[PDB]
Amino acid sequence: EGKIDEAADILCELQVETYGSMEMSEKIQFILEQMELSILKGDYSQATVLSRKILKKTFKNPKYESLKLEYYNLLVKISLHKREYLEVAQYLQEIYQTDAIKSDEAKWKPVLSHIVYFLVLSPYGNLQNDLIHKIQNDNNLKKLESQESLVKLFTTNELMRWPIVQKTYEPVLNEDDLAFGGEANKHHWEDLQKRVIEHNLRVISEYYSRITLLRLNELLDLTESQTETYISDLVNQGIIYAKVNRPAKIVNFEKPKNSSQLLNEWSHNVDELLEHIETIGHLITKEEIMH
Amino acid sequence: GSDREVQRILIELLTQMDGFDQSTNVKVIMATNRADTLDPALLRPGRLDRKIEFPSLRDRRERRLIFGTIASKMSLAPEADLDSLIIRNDSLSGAVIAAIMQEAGLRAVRKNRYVILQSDLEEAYATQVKTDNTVDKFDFYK
Amino acid sequence: LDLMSGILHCEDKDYKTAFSYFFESFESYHNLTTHNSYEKACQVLKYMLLSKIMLNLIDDVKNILNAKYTKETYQSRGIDAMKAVAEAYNNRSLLDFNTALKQYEKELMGDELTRSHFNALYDTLLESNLCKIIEPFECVEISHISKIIGLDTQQVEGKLSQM
């Protein structure tokens, strides 16, 4: 029937009430099923409430290991709808730490591919960094190369080009389902566009104090207008700070530094030169004996 | 013997308090819950011409100010209006308002919503009714 | 007596204390007889809305607006002005604000108090727009700036001269 929406509600209403008579393994099981129903309902906030009912701590035990795995599988769904790319990433990493998944060859395959897409799908910044090397450390990741070339491109500050990166990964990773391979996941392939170009921006800012706006448009592979908009958002969110000049002469990537800071710093370079001479003098002593 | 010590502090305090008049420094501000302990002739206007009374009957507007501070902390649920809280208090002071809001959000945490439900405040308000009932009174004062 | 204290703080650009007075009159009016005091409730409802717009809380617009009587009896042309401006303010677009106030020109005209705070609103939401604009730009054309705010080119020029 079409009364599927009413059906989801009834079953949740019963089980929100804490019961003690149900075994812990049964109570936990029943909540997983409530959550499922809330996905098909499409009221996602309710699923999130149901998730927070049960504790992640309790699952750790090898008995509830099975309940543990399904619990985090469901958290993927709620997060993926709301295109909170960061949160998806986090969940996928918990799935990996499961004993079952790490040990069996086959079981890690899709999960680890997913981790790589989603790390890239969250904005670059600092948070990504502290995470990405915890993923790098892992030998199972080193086995795969289809995935590896995607993460290491994004890790290196080496410039890459969008419409060419796209082709490399078009018949492989665009065609991995529940990542980019699903229908609404096609628009997450498209969203990768934004990632690739904001990353190249982030690096280019640091290296180039000044780069001509025209040059930047060719590197980024987009019209001037789109380019103008993405610089503005990146300043707002404050990773870099920049000054753009409208006739389209220069984009001057810099955060300005005052005369007092620049002068304070000059005294220190000088202090280090004075040390350099002093050390060499002891070693002159030594060297005359050595011969 | 130890009463006399309490008495020494007390007298020495009066002498200097009268004498602190017409300094630049604001004169001693003191707070008392009950003033039956104080003796009215000694401690008196002129030391202390401004004597502030703090009410407890309050008003519909006076309470409203308090509810706003509460409400900022965490957006009230849209289950029913902001204006609901306001109606149920009828004369109570801030102190009770605070005890109400404290219980309400505790129970909020269990459900897994950080928004305090308007039901919760309703139950918390309703309770605290005790304060020597009418049975004892009505058998010999009514 | 309460409404007067409310009007006086309202102009002092305080909107918490001002609100508390204007609500305290609203209630009195209802339980009073409707010889004229239904009509005086409409006017007091505008200034209740007005304080809250300036605070840019639109949660509390919705809490105030209800199916009891605000949207029935005390519903008027001025009430429409207050909610449309409220959303445009939330949107944070000085273009929409101008667009709403074009057809509510008569409402600004009959309400002196409304017209004063709406002069202020213009400038405050202008700033909120402006602080974003001048960060990632240096030597930006005024033509370009005028598109973002939504205001006239000339009008932009003159406002900045004051800022």
Side-chain angles (χ1 to χ4, degrees):
Chain A
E1 302 172 348
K3 313 281 197 77
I4 193 168
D5 303 288
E6 185 186 31
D9 304 309
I10 292 168
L11 211 66
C12 291
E13 283 168 349
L14 295 172
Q15 294 298 305
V16 170
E17 294 316 86
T18 299
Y19 297 124
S21 65
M22 302 168 175
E23 175 44 72
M24 196 190 281
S25 188
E26 306 171 353
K27 182 55 166 96
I28 291 168
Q29 178 64 63
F30 292 161
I31 292 293
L32 294 174
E33 298 165 7
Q34 300 313 316
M35 289 174 69
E36 288 168 346
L37 292 173
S38 302
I39 293 168
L40 295 174
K41 188 195 179 173
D43 188 310
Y44 280 74
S45 299
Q46 184 60 48
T48 63
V49 171
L50 292 171
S51 71
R52 291 193 294 274
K53 179 66 176 178
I54 37 181
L55 287 189
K56 288 182 177 176
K57 179 179 178 181
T58 56
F59 310 139
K60 303 295 213 286
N61 282 73
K63 175 179 180 170
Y64 309 129
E65 176 153 73
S66 57
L67 296 171
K68 184 164 40 169
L69 176 42
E70 300 312 302
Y71 178 73
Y72 303 145
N73 297 342
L74 294 171
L75 295 179
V76 172
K77 293 177 183 179
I78 294 167
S79 182
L80 184 57
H81 187 76
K82 300 294 186 184
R83 291 181 200 209
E84 288 288 276
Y85 291 120
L86 183 58
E87 293 314 315
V88 173
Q90 296 184 81
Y91 303 160
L92 291 172
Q93 291 168 331
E94 294 170 335
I95 292 167
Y96 185 67
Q97 299 311 318
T98 302
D99 290 343
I101 301 295
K102 296 184 285 201
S103 286
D104 296 75
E105 298 295 314
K107 293 192 177 200
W108 52 255
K109 276 168 204 156
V111 183
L112 286 168
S113 301
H114 291 192
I115 291 168
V116 168
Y117 304 144
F118 283 94
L119 297 166
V120 178
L121 285 163
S122 37
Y124 168 56
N126 292 89
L127 291 189
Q128 188 195 265
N129 296 6
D130 46 75
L131 288 166
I132 198 139
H133 311 315
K134 185 263 211 291
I135 292 303
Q136 166 39 55
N137 289 328
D138 186 75
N139 281 268
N140 299 300
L141 185 62
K142 298 182 204 171
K143 296 177 173 178
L144 293 167
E145 301 286 286
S146 72
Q147 295 301 312
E148 177 77 356
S149 51
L150 195 73
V151 69
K152 299 283 103 181
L153 193 44
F154 210 81
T155 288
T156 47
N157 304 126
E158 164 66 64
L159 186 78
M160 58 273 168
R161 297 179 65 193
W162 177 250
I164 298 169
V165 163
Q166 190 176 2
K167 299 198 83 67
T168 305
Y169 300 120
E170 267 291 271
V172 203
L173 316 181
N174 192 36
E175 304 303 300
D176 183 357
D177 297 63
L178 201 60
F180 294 123
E183 190 48 43
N185 297 123
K186 283 299 189 187
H187 309 319
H188 299 0
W189 188 265
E190 204 301 306
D191 194 76
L192 190 60
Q193 165 179 107
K194 307 166 180 57
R195 291 288 88 79
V196 169
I197 64 186
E198 291 166 2
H199 177 217
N200 296 335
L201 284 171
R202 280 181 201 110
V203 168
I204 288 168
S205 70
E206 295 170 353
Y207 293 175
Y208 293 73
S209 183
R210 296 185 179 89
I211 186 170
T212 57
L213 188 58
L214 294 174
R215 163 164 178 82
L216 194 69
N217 297 320
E218 308 175 350
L219 298 190
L220 285 185
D221 308 274
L222 296 169
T223 56
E224 192 172 308
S225 54
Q226 297 303 118
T227 299
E228 172 57 66
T229 299
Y230 304 146
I231 285 154
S232 314
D233 290 344
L234 197 52
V235 173
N236 289 335
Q237 296 305 288
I239 312 299
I240 63 170
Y241 166 94
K243 32 276 193 71
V244 177
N245 305 73
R246 186 47 64 191
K249 293 177 182 179
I250 66 165
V251 39
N252 170 2
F253 296 100
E254 173 166 8
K255 171 150 55 181
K257 293 180 67 174
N258 280 233
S259 66
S260 178
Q261 300 164 15
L262 282 168
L263 282 171
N264 284 333
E265 282 158 15
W266 194 74
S267 56
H268 303 314
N269 292 316
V270 183
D271 291 342
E272 294 161 351
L273 303 184
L274 297 156
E275 300 156 3
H276 291 163
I277 294 169
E278 191 65 30
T279 299
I280 292 168
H282 301 310
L283 298 174
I284 293 169
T285 313
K286 182 174 180 174
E287 168 53 37
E288 297 305 329
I289 297 300
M290 283 294 169
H291 189 283
Chain B
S2 293
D3 294 307
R4 308 183 193 186
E5 294 309 302
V6 198
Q7 302 315 311
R8 300 188 192 272
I9 292 182
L10 180 75
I11 305 180
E12 288 278 298
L13 195 78
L14 293 170
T15 296
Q16 292 176 75
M17 179 178 45
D18 199 65
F20 192 51
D21 283 346
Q22 303 166 126
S23 187
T24 303
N25 303 332
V26 57
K27 273 58 62 180
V28 201
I29 299 171
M30 298 179 163
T32 48
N33 320 343
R34 64 183 181 168
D36 66 62
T37 52
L38 305 168
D39 305 322
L42 304 164
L43 180 151
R44 71 129 65 229
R47 297 190 184 206
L48 291 160
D49 199 36
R50 281 70 170 202
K51 296 200 183 191
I52 311 178
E53 184 165 2
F54 278 92
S56 189
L57 182 62
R58 305 294 179 86
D59 289 68
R60 180 59 58 248
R61 288 184 279 100
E62 307 183 48
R63 293 184 282 271
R64 211 195 307 283
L65 307 176
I66 305 185
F67 296 144
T69 63
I70 308 177
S72 302
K73 294 174 178 156
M74 175 60 67
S75 166
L76 299 183
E79 174 176 59
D81 310 336
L82 173 288
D83 290 344
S84 64
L85 183 58
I86 313 195
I87 297 166
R88 315 171 188 131
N89 193 340
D90 298 317
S91 57
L92 298 175
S93 69
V96 193
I97 300 163
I100 298 159
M101 68 81 185
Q102 186 164 49
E103 287 180 325
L106 178 60
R107 291 178 287 154
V109 170
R110 310 192 300 169
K111 315 170 182 82
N112 303 101
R113 293 176 175 78
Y114 45 64
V115 298
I116 298 170
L117 289 80
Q118 306 303 98
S119 298
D120 308 334
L121 290 167
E122 212 189 343
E123 285 199 332
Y125 172 69
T127 60
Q128 316 196 58
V129 286
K130 303 172 190 178
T131 319
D132 299 293
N133 309 302
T134 64
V135 283
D136 70 302
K137 304 305 176 194
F138 278 10
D139 67 59
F140 73 8
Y141 296 131
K142 190 157 69 171
Chain C
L1 182 66
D2 279 346
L3 169 53
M4 295 295 305
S5 306
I7 293 168
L8 287 171
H9 301 186
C10 181
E11 292 179 331
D12 294 338
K13 306 294 172 156
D14 179 283
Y15 297 112
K16 181 176 172 62
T17 62
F19 184 72
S20 68
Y21 287 108
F22 298 140
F23 222 91
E24 193 60 17
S25 67
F26 190 65
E27 310 291 297
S28 295
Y29 275 154
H30 193 79
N31 293 332
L32 288 171
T33 191
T34 59
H35 59 271
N36 198 266
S37 294
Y38 70 106
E39 300 183 51
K40 307 162 80 188
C42 297
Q43 192 73 48
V44 160
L45 185 57
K46 290 186 288 186
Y47 306 153
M48 275 147 75
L49 292 166
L50 180 57
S51 71
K52 201 64 70 178
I53 298 165
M54 307 304 285
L55 284 155
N56 204 19
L57 305 166
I58 53 76
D59 290 286
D60 296 349
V61 174
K62 286 295 96 65
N63 298 326
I64 293 169
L65 295 177
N66 50 60
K68 292 177 182 178
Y69 31 70
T70 57
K71 282 175 188 167
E72 304 320 295
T73 302
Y74 304 142
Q75 181 66 43
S76 297
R77 194 182 194 243
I79 301 299
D80 297 307
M82 284 297 161
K83 58 163 75 76
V85 170
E87 200 43 83
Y89 193 13
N90 180 30
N91 294 326
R92 282 177 317 266
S93 170
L94 187 71
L95 182 53
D96 304 349
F97 177 49
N98 297 348
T99 304
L101 70 87
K102 186 75 182 290
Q103 62 173 307
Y104 292 128
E105 196 184 83
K106 292 71 169 175
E107 301 316 285
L108 282 71
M109 180 180 70
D111 307 308
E112 293 182 87
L113 190 67
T114 302
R115 178 183 63 104
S116 306
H117 285 285
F118 273 31
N119 286 338
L121 208 161
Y122 221 89
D123 299 305
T124 300
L125 180 54
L126 187 105
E127 289 170 353
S128 295
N129 299 325
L130 180 60
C131 290
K132 178 176 166 185
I133 291 168
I134 53 181
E135 289 167 340
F137 283 114
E138 172 55 50
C139 193
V140 58
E141 290 179 355
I142 294 169
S143 179
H144 177 69
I145 292 168
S146 304
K147 307 183 182 166
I148 308 163
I149 300 176
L151 281 168
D152 179 68
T153 298
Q154 287 192 344
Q155 189 60 66
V156 157
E157 289 168 345
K159 186 58 68 172
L160 291 171
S161 296
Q162 186 62 48
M163 301 288 105

